Amino acid sequence: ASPFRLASAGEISEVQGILRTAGLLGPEKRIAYLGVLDPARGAGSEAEDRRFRVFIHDVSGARPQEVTVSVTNGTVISAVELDTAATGELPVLEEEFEVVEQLLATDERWLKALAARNLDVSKVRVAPLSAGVFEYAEERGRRILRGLAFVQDFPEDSAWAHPVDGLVAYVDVVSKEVTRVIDTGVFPVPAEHGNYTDPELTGPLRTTQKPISITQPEGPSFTVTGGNHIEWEKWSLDVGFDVREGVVLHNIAFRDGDRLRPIINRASIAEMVVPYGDPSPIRSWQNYFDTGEYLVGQYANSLELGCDCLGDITYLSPVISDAFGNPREIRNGICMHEEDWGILAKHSDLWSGINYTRRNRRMVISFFTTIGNYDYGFYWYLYLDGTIEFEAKATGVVFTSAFPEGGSDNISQLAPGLGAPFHQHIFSARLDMAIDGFTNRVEEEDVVRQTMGPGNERGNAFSRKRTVLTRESEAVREADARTGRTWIISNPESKNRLNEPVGYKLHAHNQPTLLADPGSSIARRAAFATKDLWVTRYADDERYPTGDFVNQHSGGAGLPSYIAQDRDIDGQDIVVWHTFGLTHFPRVEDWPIMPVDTVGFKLRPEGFFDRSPVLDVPAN
Amino acid sequence: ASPFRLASAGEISEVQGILRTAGLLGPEKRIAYLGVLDPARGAGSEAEDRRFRVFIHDVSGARPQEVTVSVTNGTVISAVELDTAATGELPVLEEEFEVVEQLLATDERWLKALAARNLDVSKVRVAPLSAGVFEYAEERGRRILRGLAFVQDFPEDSAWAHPVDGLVAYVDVVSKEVTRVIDTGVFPVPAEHGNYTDPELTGPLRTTQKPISITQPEGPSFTVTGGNHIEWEKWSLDVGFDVREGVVLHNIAFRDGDRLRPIINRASIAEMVVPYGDPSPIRSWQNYFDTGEYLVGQYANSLELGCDCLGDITYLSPVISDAFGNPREIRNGICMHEEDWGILAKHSDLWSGINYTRRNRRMVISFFTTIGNYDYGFYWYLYLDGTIEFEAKATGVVFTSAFPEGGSDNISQLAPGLGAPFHQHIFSARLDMAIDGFTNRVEEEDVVRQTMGPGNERGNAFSRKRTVLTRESEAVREADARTGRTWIISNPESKNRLNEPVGYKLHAHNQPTLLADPGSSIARRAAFATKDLWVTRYADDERYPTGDFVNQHSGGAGLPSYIAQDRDIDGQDIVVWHTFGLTHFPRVEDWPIMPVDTVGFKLRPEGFFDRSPVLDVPAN
Numbered sequence A, B: 001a002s003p004f005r006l007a008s009a010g011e012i013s014e015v016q017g018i019l020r021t022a023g024l025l026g027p028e029k030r031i032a033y034l035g036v037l038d039p040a041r042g043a044g045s046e047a048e049d050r051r052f053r054v055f056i057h058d059v060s061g062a063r064p065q066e067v068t069v070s071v072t073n074g075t076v077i078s079a080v081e082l083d084t085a086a087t088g089e090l091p092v093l094e095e096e097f098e099v100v101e102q103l104l105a106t107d108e109r110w111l112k113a114l115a116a117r118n119l120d121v122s123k124v125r126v127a128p129l130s131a132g133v134f135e136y137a138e139e140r141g142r143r144i145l146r147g148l149a150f151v152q153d154f155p156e157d158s159a160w161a162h163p164v165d166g167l168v169a170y171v172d173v174v175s176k177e178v179t180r181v182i183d184t185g186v187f188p189v190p191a192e193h194g195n196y197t198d199p200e201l202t203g204p205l206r207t208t209q210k211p212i213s214i215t216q217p218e219g220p221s222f223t224v225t226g227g228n229h230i231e232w233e234k235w236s237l238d239v240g241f242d243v244r245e246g247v248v249l250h251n252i253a254f255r256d257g258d259r260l261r262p263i264i265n266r267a268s269i270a271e272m273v274v275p276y277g278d279p280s281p282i283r284s285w286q287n288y289f290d291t292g293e294y295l296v297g298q299y300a301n302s303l304e305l306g307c308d309c310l311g312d313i314t315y316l317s318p319v320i321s322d323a324f325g326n327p328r329e330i331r332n333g334i335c336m337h338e339e340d341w342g343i344l345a346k347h348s349d350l351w352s353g354i355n356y357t358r359r360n361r362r363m364v365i366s367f368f369t370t371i372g373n374y375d376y377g378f379y380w381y382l383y384l385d386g387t388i389e390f391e392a393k394a395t396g397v398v399f400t401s402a403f404p405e406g407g408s409d410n411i412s413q414l415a416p417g418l419g420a421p422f423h424q425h426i427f428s429a430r431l432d433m434a435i436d437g438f439t440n441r442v443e444e445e446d447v448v449r450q451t452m453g454p455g456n457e458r459g460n461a462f463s464r465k466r467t468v469l470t471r472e473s474e475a476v477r478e479a480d481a482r483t484g485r486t487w488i489i490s491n492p493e494s495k496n497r498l499n500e501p502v503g504y505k506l507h508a509h510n511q512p513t514l515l516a517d518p519g520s521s522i523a524r525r526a527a528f529a530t531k532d533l534w535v536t537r538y539a540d541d542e543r544y545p546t547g548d549f550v551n552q553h554s555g556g557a558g559l560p561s562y563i564a565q566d567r568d569i570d571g572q573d574i575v576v577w578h579t580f581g582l583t584h585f586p587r588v589e590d591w592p593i594m595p596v597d598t599v600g601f602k603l604r605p606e607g608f609f610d611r612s613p614v615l616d617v618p619a620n
């Protein structure tokens, strides 16, 4: 019944049939993206209309299309032909990955480069990487991938231990042409293996770990209804899934006594970029837009009980489309569970004699994706006290290079002759706010130091200041950890019992933002990553901070163009975009498989409730 | 056996007997501090010589003494008379707290102030607080406490809901004299109760929480030998307890194959200060040095299985001295257990076909202390991957005031007429480092941005720089979150297999440091709190960042005096002092009992190991 239900296999099958009957899904067509559209703003929307947005690629070279279909009515709403030289190429297709290695295997320049290095072409794996936009005029309007080579000594070998430096190739994957092969010089291929399941490397496995058993003998405290609607400890929300963004949370609300109070209308990770900081021409173009170029939802892992998710686990198995419109299930792709989270509140009072302890809990919604060498876990947490938190967990195998004789200012050494280029992992959270409703504003809160003097004779006072962001042109903000800077999202029309506007405070980790030069290609294409906080006025079509078509788009799309409209955001329907990331100088301990590192943000109530919201938690 | 074993009841009784026999502990004497001294530098050395340091107060007004005793030999090693007007007063005695309310109840100025407010003296509780050093010349050399009043409507009432603003009194607790009673005017006493166990306020308790059961069917993975020596998943350490500092960690080492490698010789929270930012004369003197003035270990809670600590718990019950030298056991005062900690490492490789997942765990060592209205949890974590982390959990009841009718820039409103002054909670971690031995150095690491141009034509490169701190005068450092600043502790004489010095990296939370005016009394007494990182050369008597005697001591001791020696710290036996804290602008949700908020720091290996140290973790 819910407009926010997960897409079903039958819905995707019907999209396929509609596209087919309409003549838009011939044998030369490929679906590069398919997803359900959210309902438009309408607090009286009764008629069910499930609409899907599709990006259709053409393998023969014809122009691609963007199509919207109504599966409820069995109709095509609109279909637009795309000029990709202007608006950007479609996301990379899974089937285009294999094409790069196969094309290069018959190119005489590639084979000559491998022969000079005494490498058997049958053992050379090619990582197919997005191209970006640089100096090659012949690439505009063409679907390009760039390839970097790694040697696999045997079929179960970790090829990442054996980069082939000094060599890169560019490939047109539509016309199947190798456009350039660049060979800058012979580097030794690092010889040590990185096989983290080889006993020669692990040594004898530990026998000292005893089991930790986490069970819920009466079942979990949350309920799931309608497939994806969660109720847990006064929280209410819908768990969505999109092939581009991954897990999306809808309609996050909190039951405060009799009233269901909205907090966040839609929360997602709307982009994530991995820029590399090695100036070598072999890699200086390397920037992954994992969400926008690759689509992180389509590479989601099936999560194994007891290994990936421990405890009493409830799974969702989202359905996506393959390249031909057939539904594909990602079995056990989302884990949901609650877990103990230590002490919530504690006080032992001398005067009253009362000793009081309560425990905390959090609800966890998670999925994991794998893009080539990297694996990312996305975790949303809901706490008893009203806190919402997101955490990204980065693991996998670091991207490698040769370690140059004489060292490097931009590459870490991991093993003899083996390097790991410096890079960042930067995320954009898109938070469509609805604090007690849609009339919201953002205030920037700084600590204020005060000077010793009249009214502050002992020099102990300090205070704080709040600045309302009133228009989009002034709503591009930077972190300031030294002044304790946070941002408050409030509803000026909804007051708590002290007659103060209700609000939530955003706490950032204050990690560095994009380090690249402001004139670089990546700074233009990932402009969102240069500032910690952006606020826009809500609009239906302003979905991603990098625009709809990120692959090989020249720049400026997304947030810089939205913000230019300079719309009123003071007590309006607004969207908060928070940039946060990890700056990774790889360490020896990251090799040959990297222990998890984390980054995130959290939102805490700030006078949203009339008192602590967890006074009714029992002692248990 | 071990020189680092916990003090036993018999050792404390023996100290009492030695002091009595020596004539230093007659009926007018009180023990204000007693603790075991760590062994001096040198392996083996004294075979076994357990020495105790004692601060002895005299209730007749005679000069107090500092005494060192050898319990092994039954001798007084040294005993020195203290001039407290010079070097500071002794820590506050538990028995002195009761004195304050009783003395005020018979003072006619106090009674007249209460009569003006129609308050029954039998219902007025007085919070006895440390005095600091301000403008009152008559306090020099006297033991003073200051008292703030709260009304308790009935014996089980939370008095914190009913502050009596406009009133403060100062008390000489040795001569039993009320020195001053200051009344700046009548404020309404806030009338709403704050009784968080009253059903009228909690409402009906939730029935929705189902149990989470955490068990270890084969017992825990760690072993405890010699009372306090822990071995867990390659870690080795001794858990100490001191009545001033609380839990102290000794001899933290990691078993790397055949070798036990030292990392940290001694880790403790060596001071913690809570300064208030309300310029009202009623509270502008208010600064708690919970460690140095009150002694946090003295007020450690007994922790209840299933509520405070959940899982398979191993307890330690440390013994401290009471004011007469009798041993007192804090039953179940320290909880130890291991916890699942999610995914450790994960990769699904397309080319090799291998899917790999391992889970993380951490060892937890914790205790909780209650100082009046506040309750603090101290948590040390050891992780499988070599990470060490500390986290402080702040909860309890916020300190209250009236909320002035026309508002305030320095106080939050929590309830009608009820305010909560702004304050900070600032900690000092003292890390006596021993990275692969005692020859250590500290490097500050900043990210370096690079300009687009020759050698960086695409404007993508970024790098980092490390600056060695060579002398104490240059080792007072500030955070810089914008440049990703961290500090590396390395051993220049111990190299990993890549011929790089082994090291650990300190990751700070980059929260604001002390906000008070640098000319204030608190900035002089808590000078450590004005900077994020200090490095000193190890010395036996440089134990606390505030000096030995903090109570009513002006500036002139502690870290600023230590670093003036300007000692060589480049490849030497060094101590890192890290300041970190919370800046608390109280919110409505903090009332009437505060949900936990947290702050901390972590240390991660940085080329300490030759590869990932968790390759031998099993799947299971």
Ligand SMILES: [Cu+2]
Pocket: A394, A398, A423, A424, A425, A584
């Ligand atoms: Cu990385």
Ligand SMILES: [Cu+2]
Pocket: B394, B398, B423, B424, B425, B584
């Ligand atoms: Cu506080």
Ligand code: NA
Pocket: B265, B432, B433, B434, B438, B538, B572, B573, B574, B575
């Ligand atoms: Na040291």
